[PDB]
């Protein structure tokens, strides 16, 4: 039946199986999707969140090596607009965890889920407790 | 046309773009391939080429996420055997650079290149170099 649009944005830094499980959890929220990834600027992401350590280009051609990414918009503006949805016809935005309340508001929301630990930093520290 | 069976096997220890170029060649050495990956054991690997930091299951659970991936082989053997090849009908076994030698014998190996510099150990020297 009919095909869903679904939008993820994320930094996307050293994608780690967290990040994965959340795409695949995105991709699969309906029968027949498109799943479209966006892909924070370094400058917005540096200015806003935090340090980031891959740049760009680097984060974004990780994420074309992921089997449920359908299409990436990179960069991806920092804030999600109405305007945003009805140019890239999106017609639900899948994100963790209000700058959300509007979509919600909307019911264009779709919760998806963080997995810890997972992440490459925690490798380091798998590494590097091998000396005591 | 034709159907053609490709096994890649490795450690795919910390995944980076690196690997994940590899296995987009060897899924594309053909127009119509199924990309058989394997996956050394934990003990094989730590016992025949160095630490791992990576359990099986997890160096899996990744690999399971890559679009090239068609099947996962995990535990795969350690040494590729002439009944390896007849048991999984594979038609060309694709890994970089004899031990190789009677495949290529065979006309059964395609040669795959890594990429130097994007692996998970140089990112943390990139975390690192923001401290002199
Ligand atoms: O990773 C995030 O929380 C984020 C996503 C989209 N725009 C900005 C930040
Ligand atoms: O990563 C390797 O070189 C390897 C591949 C398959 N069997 C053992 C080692």
Redesign the interface.
């Known amino acids: 039946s009919k095909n869903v649009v679904i939008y993820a944005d994320g930094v996307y830094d050293?994608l780690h199986?967290g990040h994965?499980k959340q795409?695949?959890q995105a991709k699969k929220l309906f029968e027949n999707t498109t799943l479209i990834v966006g892909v924070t600027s370094d400058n917005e992401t540096k200015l806003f969140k935090g340090?980031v350590?891959?740049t760009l280009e680097?984060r974004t051609?990780?994420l074309?090596?992921?089997?449920?990414?359908d299409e990436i918009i990179s960069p991806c503006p920092w804030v999600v607009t109405p305007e945003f949805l009805e140019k890239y016809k999106i017609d639900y935005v899948a994100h963790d965890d209000d700058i959300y309340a509007w979509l919600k508001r909307a019911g264009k929301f779709k919760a998806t889920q963080r997995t810890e630990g997972?992440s490459?930093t925690d490798?380091?520290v798998?590494?590097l407790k091998?000396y005591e």
Chains 1, 2 share one sequence.
């Open positions: 050293m199986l994965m795409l695949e340090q350590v891959q680097e051609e990780t074309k090596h992921i089997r449920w990414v997972v490459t490798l380091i798998r590494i091998n």
